[PDB]
Write an enzyme that holds these catalytic residues in place. Sequence first.
Site, PDB file in Angstrom:
ATOM      1  N   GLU A  12       0.789  -1.224   0.000  1.00  0.00           N
ATOM      2  CA  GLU A  12       0.000   0.000   0.000  1.00  0.00           C
ATOM      3  C   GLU A  12       0.823   1.277   0.000  1.00  0.00           C
ATOM      4  O   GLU A  12       0.341   2.312  -0.467  1.00  0.00           O
ATOM      5  CB  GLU A  12      -0.924   0.035   1.216  1.00  0.00           C
ATOM      6  CG  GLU A  12      -2.258   0.698   0.949  1.00  0.00           C
ATOM      7  CD  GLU A  12      -3.326  -0.304   0.512  1.00  0.00           C
ATOM      8  OE1 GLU A  12      -4.408   0.144   0.061  1.00  0.00           O
ATOM      9  OE2 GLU A  12      -3.092  -1.539   0.620  1.00  0.00           O
ATOM     10  N   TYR A  15       2.021   6.434   0.149  1.00  0.00           N
ATOM     11  CA  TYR A  15       1.526   7.261  -0.959  1.00  0.00           C
ATOM     12  C   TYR A  15       1.085   6.569  -2.278  1.00  0.00           C
ATOM     13  O   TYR A  15       0.568   7.228  -3.190  1.00  0.00           O
ATOM     14  CB  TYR A  15       2.466   8.447  -1.227  1.00  0.00           C
ATOM     15  CG  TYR A  15       1.728   9.786  -1.394  1.00  0.00           C
ATOM     16  CD1 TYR A  15       1.622  10.698  -0.322  1.00  0.00           C
ATOM     17  CD2 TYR A  15       1.125  10.137  -2.621  1.00  0.00           C
ATOM     18  CE1 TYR A  15       0.943  11.927  -0.478  1.00  0.00           C
ATOM     19  CE2 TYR A  15       0.445  11.348  -2.782  1.00  0.00           C
ATOM     20  CZ  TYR A  15       0.359  12.238  -1.713  1.00  0.00           C
ATOM     21  OH  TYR A  15      -0.309  13.432  -1.884  1.00  0.00           O
ATOM     22  N   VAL A  17      -0.231   2.456  -4.255  1.00  0.00           N
ATOM     23  CA  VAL A  17      -0.278   0.997  -4.456  1.00  0.00           C
ATOM     24  C   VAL A  17       0.999   0.420  -5.106  1.00  0.00           C
ATOM     25  O   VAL A  17       1.556   0.998  -6.037  1.00  0.00           O
ATOM     26  CB  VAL A  17      -1.521   0.611  -5.282  1.00  0.00           C
ATOM     27  CG1 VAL A  17      -1.552  -0.873  -5.595  1.00  0.00           C
ATOM     28  CG2 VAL A  17      -2.768   1.006  -4.532  1.00  0.00           C
ATOM     29  N   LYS A  33       5.317   0.844  -7.954  1.00  0.00           N
ATOM     30  CA  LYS A  33       4.551   1.823  -7.227  1.00  0.00           C
ATOM     31  C   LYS A  33       3.731   2.584  -8.249  1.00  0.00           C
ATOM     32  O   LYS A  33       4.275   3.075  -9.239  1.00  0.00           O
ATOM     33  CB  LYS A  33       5.461   2.810  -6.514  1.00  0.00           C
ATOM     34  CG  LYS A  33       5.023   3.135  -5.094  1.00  0.00           C
ATOM     35  CD  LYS A  33       5.541   4.472  -4.610  1.00  0.00           C
ATOM     36  CE  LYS A  33       5.442   4.603  -3.104  1.00  0.00           C
ATOM     37  NZ  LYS A  33       6.698   4.172  -2.440  1.00  0.00           N
ATOM     38  N   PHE A  82      12.402  -6.401  -7.309  1.00  0.00           N
ATOM     39  CA  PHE A  82      11.443  -7.130  -6.495  1.00  0.00           C
ATOM     40  C   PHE A  82      12.148  -7.851  -5.374  1.00  0.00           C
ATOM     41  O   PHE A  82      13.123  -8.562  -5.596  1.00  0.00           O
ATOM     42  CB  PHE A  82      10.670  -8.120  -7.345  1.00  0.00           C
ATOM     43  CG  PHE A  82       9.669  -8.920  -6.582  1.00  0.00           C
ATOM     44  CD1 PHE A  82       8.441  -8.363  -6.224  1.00  0.00           C
ATOM     45  CD2 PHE A  82       9.937 -10.253  -6.246  1.00  0.00           C
ATOM     46  CE1 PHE A  82       7.497  -9.116  -5.529  1.00  0.00           C
ATOM     47  CE2 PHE A  82       9.011 -11.013  -5.549  1.00  0.00           C
ATOM     48  CZ  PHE A  82       7.785 -10.444  -5.187  1.00  0.00           C
ATOM     49  N   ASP A 127      10.628   6.969   8.118  1.00  0.00           N
ATOM     50  CA  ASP A 127       9.540   6.010   8.251  1.00  0.00           C
ATOM     51  C   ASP A 127      10.024   4.564   8.402  1.00  0.00           C
ATOM     52  O   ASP A 127       9.423   3.629   7.867  1.00  0.00           O
ATOM     53  CB  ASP A 127       8.513   6.150   7.117  1.00  0.00           C
ATOM     54  CG  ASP A 127       7.098   5.759   7.561  1.00  0.00           C
ATOM     55  OD1 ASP A 127       6.839   5.749   8.796  1.00  0.00           O
ATOM     56  OD2 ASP A 127       6.242   5.454   6.689  1.00  0.00           O
TER      57      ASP A 127
HETATM   58  N1  LIG Z   1       6.355   0.843   0.441  1.00  0.00           N
HETATM   59  C1  LIG Z   1       7.166   0.362  -0.489  1.00  0.00           C
HETATM   60  N2  LIG Z   1       8.179   1.066  -1.042  1.00  0.00           N
HETATM   61  C2  LIG Z   1       8.877   0.353  -1.987  1.00  0.00           C
HETATM   62  O1  LIG Z   1       9.834   0.799  -2.617  1.00  0.00           O
HETATM   63  C3  LIG Z   1       8.366  -0.938  -2.151  1.00  0.00           C
HETATM   64  C4  LIG Z   1       8.871  -1.860  -3.018  1.00  0.00           C
HETATM   65  C5  LIG Z   1       8.693  -3.298  -2.738  1.00  0.00           C
HETATM   66  C6  LIG Z   1       9.417  -4.310  -3.238  1.00  0.00           C
HETATM   67  C7  LIG Z   1       8.935  -5.456  -2.723  1.00  0.00           C
HETATM   68  C8  LIG Z   1       7.915  -5.147  -1.913  1.00  0.00           C
HETATM   69  C9  LIG Z   1       7.147  -6.022  -1.168  1.00  0.00           C
HETATM   70  C10 LIG Z   1       6.322  -5.517  -0.160  1.00  0.00           C
HETATM   71  C11 LIG Z   1       5.545  -6.377   0.603  1.00  0.00           C
HETATM   72  C12 LIG Z   1       5.579  -7.748   0.361  1.00  0.00           C
HETATM   73  S1  LIG Z   1       4.585  -8.834   1.332  1.00  0.00           S
HETATM   74  N3  LIG Z   1       3.166  -8.098   1.690  1.00  0.00           N
HETATM   75  O2  LIG Z   1       5.307  -9.176   2.607  1.00  0.00           O
HETATM   76  O3  LIG Z   1       4.318 -10.098   0.555  1.00  0.00           O
HETATM   77  C13 LIG Z   1       6.394  -8.259  -0.658  1.00  0.00           C
HETATM   78  C14 LIG Z   1       7.184  -7.392  -1.420  1.00  0.00           C
HETATM   79  O4  LIG Z   1       7.774  -3.817  -1.917  1.00  0.00           O
HETATM   80  S2  LIG Z   1       7.056  -1.203  -1.124  1.00  0.00           S
END
Ligand SMILES: N=C1NC(=O)/C(=C/c2ccc(-c3ccc(S(N)(=O)=O)cc3)o2)S1
Lengths: 296, 258
Positions: A12, A15, A17, A33, A82, A127
């Site tokens: 989420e 800022y 999805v 994002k 990723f 954060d």
């Molecule tokens: N708030 C964010 N800022 C980023 O750059 C993000 C990039 C990113 C890469 C991989 C992930 C990611 C986030 C959560 C999961 S989860 N819900 O644990 O399966 C799995 C992967 O977020 S998320």
Amino acid sequence: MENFQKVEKIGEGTYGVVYKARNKLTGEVVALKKIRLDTETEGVPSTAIREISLLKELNHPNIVKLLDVIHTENKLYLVFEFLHQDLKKFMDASALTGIPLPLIKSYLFQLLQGLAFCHSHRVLHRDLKPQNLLINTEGAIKLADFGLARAFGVPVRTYTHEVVTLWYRAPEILLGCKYYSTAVDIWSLGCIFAEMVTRRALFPGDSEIDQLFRIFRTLGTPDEVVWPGVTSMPDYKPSFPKWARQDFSKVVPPLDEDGRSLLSQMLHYDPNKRISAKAALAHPFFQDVTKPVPHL
Amino acid sequence: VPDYHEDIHTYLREMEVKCKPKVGYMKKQPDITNSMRAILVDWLVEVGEEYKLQNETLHLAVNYIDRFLSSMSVLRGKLQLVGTAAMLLASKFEEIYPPEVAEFVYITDDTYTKKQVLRMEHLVLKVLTFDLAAPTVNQFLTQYFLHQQPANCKVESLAMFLGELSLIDADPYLKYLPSVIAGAAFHLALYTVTGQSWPESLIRKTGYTLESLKPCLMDLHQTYLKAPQHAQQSIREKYKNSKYHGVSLLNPPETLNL
Ligand SMILES: N=C1NC(=O)/C(=C/c2ccc(-c3ccc(S(N)(=O)=O)cc3)o2)S1
């Protein structure tokens, strides 16, 4: 935008999805994002200006790699490497046994290195929380989500007050100080350190004052002896209840003497006394650090 | 002295070389000229004052402008627009409460529409490839101020003033890195006020001797002597206020003796 097949919603952000996706052509797996523009009000959010422009400077193996910015007419997409999942979901999935100590040590070392690089490149993350820390399968952890970050000056001046997620917010922000710097990130890491050890958030308040009391109740209510100047901070109240400081071996039982030492340095009330990311790496708690693989 | 002072400084020295507009860019601009840019920057000062913005935002803006014009041809009627989206992006980057877009439309006297400023914002971003964390004369100035024996406020405001003059004149100042101009502004302030020179500590920190700052001092001295005759006066008027200790009213030294 058409080289990507979206796979699913993964997150989420503060800022926008985030999706898992794949490059149809290279096969590369990525995170997307979506930042919503909708055109005619304020244009591109300051949030994204900061995130993209800081992340481009911040290339380091313990910081998420930004691969691309797709800068359409209607939307902005940030394309990241990723990573398998967040520390948060990893912790929830490790509640009954707990994360192995050597893994904690490693995650902490790695995070501290990411933070050191940030601070040495004049950036506050602001954060740092477990759903913003990203873990892969080869034992690496990376700081993610710089939507709330900023470039600080030397010396600092007043920054935004509405800063850091409650559970992880340093007392100097809770108490309304004019100035804060890099120490706010160390405090957050301290709480995170503790969380990996206990499987429970350290200071899980539900309001600013509740948060304050949860900190006080554990670390002792601050006074002039421990933190010169507390009693004259804008949101300090003489009527704050006076709880005694609890013993660290009760707070965070599994830790040895070195862990406690380090934790106590990260969680110092006085931002001026609080250990830096760089100094922390020199801490004797890391004399035997390795790279364990997570039990996924 | 803050935790990462030395580190950040080394890093800004690496970045000031990457955040560079090409020097003779105005020579290849078919319609606009240095004196026009000078009118623009001056205006941007007026705007920072009206909206009580940080000096750092002004500096960021000018850097974006010089980098944008380094690669885009711009006609005179569009010059203000580039500056307006520069200033708006500098604000969004650096301020707690950037003014809103409607407030940027307003001070162009409605020359441009909201729709336009937002499109120009998008383009400026596209052209600078989202690289906005640029070092400024200002960043180095503050960084240098910490090596002060002791903290003279007059010296500070005056250095700030001198560095801000540097923004207005692309010829010659685009020749110099921000750190160098900063060095120059600092020694020139220090001298003018107290007679002291660019101290031993900074020579160690920056690697810069009075001798390496000399060419920039030569130019900055000139600018400072010619300051009240200059067509653009917004900075002189700004640095007359008590907030800045009226430093723009002090007499420059006749010679620099170097
Ligand atoms: N708030 C964010 N800022 C980023 O750059 C993000 C990039 C990113 C890469 C991989 C992930 C990611 C986030 C959560 C999961 S989860 N819900 O644990 O399966 C799995 C992967 O977020 S998320």
